[PDB]
């Protein structure tokens, strides 16, 4: 997906 950072792992 390519998420904006670590808070969505």
């Amino acid at each position: 997906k390519h998420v904006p950072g670590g808070g969505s792992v």
């Epitope: 390519h2 904006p4 950072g5 670590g6 808070g7 969505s8 792992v9």
Partner: antibody, heavy 120, light 113 residues
């Protein structure tokens, strides 16, 4: 031996565009994001934005939306940043860094920086 | 859109002394599923591009001496250098990757002699 290669110092005239390359080697280019970071003389590091070369997806720091445009050429394993309509606020050193997306989420290898001086 | 603060902004110690420096985020950097704080520490020497020291708050990156120790959680983090060396002269930055990325203002380390 992961390595990120950036172009030499540049002088650009105010109002113009500058496009600088960051050539990656030693790893799978498409498995890590490339972050870009600005540093004004004597000042701190300021995050600009990132690109995922696999997919071309980008995020930006709000301050750099429509000032910076990040792109990536998978055939050459090279990332580019474009600063548009430059002003003396853009005179700075701009690093690219490999950014371990999905795991560490850190920037583990850096380029040497491209020193941009915007002046007449 | 997480703001980061570092303190103190400047610091002097003699070779061999212990030093600690603090880093604060406007939000928790802790993600419940992974159980990791997305906080890293970087060292920047004069004429040099930044080098990653520590990620996930407290994990040393390979090649980094063990005297550099990262610690803390949520919004309050610490880098400690036990037994500072003359080579450690640098500015130390913290940075958040919980959501986008944000560098702290940096803490400059000067050596007394």
């Amino acid at each position: 031996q992961v390595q990120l290669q950036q172009s030499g110092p540049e002088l650009v005239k105010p109002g113009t565009s500058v496009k600088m390359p960051c050539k990656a080697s030693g790893y799978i280019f498409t498995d890590y994001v490339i972050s870009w970071v600005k540093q004004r003389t004597g000042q701190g590091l300021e995050w600009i934005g990132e690109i995922f070369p696999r997919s071309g997806s980008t995020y930006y720091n709000e301050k750099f939306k429509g000032k910076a445009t990040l792109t990536a050429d998978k055939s050459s394993n090279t990332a580019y940043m474009q600063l548009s309509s430059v002003t003396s606020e853009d005179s700075a050193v701009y690093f690219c860094a490999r950014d371990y997306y999905g795991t560490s989420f850190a920037m583990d290898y850096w380029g040497q920086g491209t020193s941009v001086t915007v002046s007449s | 859109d997480i703001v980061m603060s570092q303190s103190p902004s400047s610091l002097a110690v003699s070779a061999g002394e212990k030093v600690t420096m603090s880093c604060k985020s406007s939000q928790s950097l802790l993600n419940s599923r992974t159980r990791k704080n997305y906080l890293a520490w970087y060292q920047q020497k004069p004429g040099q591009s930044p080098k990653l020291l520590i990620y996930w708050a407290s994990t040393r990156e390979s090649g980094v001496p063990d005297r550099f120790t990262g610690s803390g959680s949520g919004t309050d983090f610490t880098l400690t250098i036990s037994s500072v060396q003359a080579e450690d002269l640098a500015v130390y930055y913290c940075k958040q990757s919980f959501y986008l990325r944000t560098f702290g203002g940096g803490t400059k380390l000067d050596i007394k002699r």
